[model samples]
Target: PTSLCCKQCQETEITTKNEIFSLSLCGPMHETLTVYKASNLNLIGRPSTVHSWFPGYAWTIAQCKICASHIGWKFTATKKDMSPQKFWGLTRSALLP
Candidate 1:
């Protein structure tokens, strides 16, 4: 089994298979790496706007409240005419090797 955790600290973000995004034009997150998708995750605190991806998307930048380090992001399909399910991602940059 594979487990993902916060690089700053072992927060044990998720446990599952992770893959890298094929497209690299999304943007950056201060620091990041191998991205993975999850239907939902056990996260803490609400979404903050200090730094986020896009304004027209259905996702928010999620991070740590203790050290202010990054984990990944929490995303949800924001199409009003479509179903937007809540999901999340974890990066390898902030993950242990």
Candidate 2:
């Protein structure tokens, strides 16, 4: 995965606290057009007991722990949100069959 600084505030602490949910690509068994697996990587501070519509889907929102600045979704993962099949320089064509 590529390293990206918080867009709102560069000095903001990059912790998994304010994360709303997680997403990842499905494993090989559930493989569709994509090759890698994916799943939601949950946050640290957020309540894990909440029931979200998309259970495993990570919401496209972020808040800096230090400065409390909003940092939108920076990464887009494959279906199921388990494995990061493609990002930045990497594309679906390069990894998918």
Candidate 3:
């Protein structure tokens, strides 16, 4: 089983162009590995965001604020804009679900 993290206090609105789904805190809190496990989760064209902090002065992983799961590592065009780009990615994902 997966370990539980802190509960999310906000709701996530997921829109799939055809239908909508509301994801809540009850969803899984996954690690980077788990996010990769979900086939539907597209890493390309997806927002590159930072969700949490880790070692090595880099945010190697992110969390789904809506479901509270660790989504994946962030890839940025450059180190200078990494933070802001990551923030936008996460913010956009939050708006989705």
Candidate closest to the true structure, highest TM-score: 1
lDDT value, residue 37 of candidate 2: 22
Residue 63, candidate 2: C-alpha displacement in angstroms: 2.1
TM-score of 3: 0.22
Q: How many residue pairs clash in each candidate?
A: 0, 21, 4
Clashes of 1: 0
Off by over 4 Å in 1: 18-56, 80-84
lDDT (CA) for every model shown? 0.51, 0.32, 0.32
Which 10 consecutive positions of candidate 1 have the poorest summed lDDT?
A: 33-42
Model 1: per-residue Cα lDDT at residue 64: 55
Question: What is the model-wide C-alpha lDDT for candidate 2?
Answer: 0.32
TM-score of each: 0.48, 0.28, 0.22
Model 2 agreement with the true structure over 32-74: per-residue lDDT tens digits: 1221222222223432213332343333333445555443222
Task: Write out the backbone clash pairs for model 3.
Answer: 12-97, 13-96, 13-97, 49-86
Per-residue lDDT of candidate 1, residues 1-97 (tens digit): 3655556856545434454443235677434442446422445556554434534344465665545565667755455554234445556576655
Top candidate on lDDT is: 1
